Design a protein around this ligand. Structure first.
Ligand SMILES: [Ca+2]
Ligand SMILES: [Ca+2]
Ligand SMILES: [K+]
Length: 275
């Protein structure tokens, strides 16, 4: 039996699926710990490794990248879970090692790969406390080249009156995604600030794990792929739409929650966003 994870339904993804909008022919790059290409519920189209000691992008030694990819594109079948954009062309851009960490050089090389490889959507379920001129340049070029760039806002919670939004999420060109639970409440870990764009489900997210497994994870890292998945859904309907048009539609059609410093524009609604 297939299970539809809460977060899929919450964002109104099945409404587009019923209409035949499933993200077919949209290339989504999961810039992460790799993807387990061996998982029965995933179809990996390609990718590349930027981790010097872990040369195979289709070996997830972490679990992180397989779980992110399952949220985006877990196949519509009789098994496992259901992704947001189940027909999307999934790319494993391995930038993180087995420990879940990576060098800036590795991540930036991964972004650079994604631009050269004509990726429609980048998902970056990662962040750091500090930026770089090279990090900003790679995200900026990706947006200038027509790529939809989506990132996790961070898991830093509240800190006085300051923004706790990490990089690359902090950059204007990037969609920064915060976490809500099933009730539409902001998760206590969810990074806050003026740079917060949108909210998506990020608490106890059921997805694919390596070795034909399924399990839940929590974080803004879980919320991000819901937005990257939603961007793929829009593009399958409106193939002609710019990255700018995709972004404005996602932010302009949200279910409004609390204050923008905590919730940004609110919860994404792909059904309203797809027009
Ligand atoms: Ca499935
Ligand atoms: Ca922003
Ligand atoms: K941003």
């Amino acid at each position: 039996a297939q299970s539809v994870p809460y977060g899929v339904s919450q964002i109104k993804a099945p409404a587009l699926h019923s209409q035949g909008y499933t993200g077919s022919n949209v290339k989504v790059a999961v810039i992460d710990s790799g993807i387990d290409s061996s998982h029965p519920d995933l179809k990996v189209a390609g990718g590349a490794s930027f981790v010097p000691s872990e040369t195979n992008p289709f070996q997830d030694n972490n679990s992180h990248g397989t779980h992110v990819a399952g949220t985006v594109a877990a196949l519509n079948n009789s098994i496992g879970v259901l992704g947001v954009a189940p027909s999307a062309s999934l790319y494993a851009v391995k930038v993180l090692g087995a420990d879940g960490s990576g060098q800036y050089s590795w991540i930036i090389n991964g972004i650079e790969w994604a631009i050269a490889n004509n990726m429609d959507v980048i998902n970056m379920s990662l962040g750091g406390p500090s930026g770089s001129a090279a990090l900003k340049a790679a995200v900026d070029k990706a947006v200038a080249s027509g790529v939809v760039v989506v990132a996790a806002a961070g898991n830093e919670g509240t800190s006085g009156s300051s923004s706790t939004v990490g990089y690359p999420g902090k950059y204007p060109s990037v969609i920064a995604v915060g976490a809500v639970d099933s009730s539409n409440q902001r998760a206590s870990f969810s990074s806050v600030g003026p740079e917060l764009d949108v909210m998506a489900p990020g608490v106890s997210i059921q997805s694919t794990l390596p070795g034909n497994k399924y399990g839940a994870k929590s974080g803004t890292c879980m919320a991000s792929p819901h937005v990257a998945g939603a961007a793929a859904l829009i593009l399958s309907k409106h193939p002609n739409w710019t990255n700018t048009q995709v972004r404005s539609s996602l932010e302009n059609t949200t279910t409004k929650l609390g204050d923008s410093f905590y919730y940004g524009k609110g919860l994404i609604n792909v059904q309203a966003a797809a027009q």
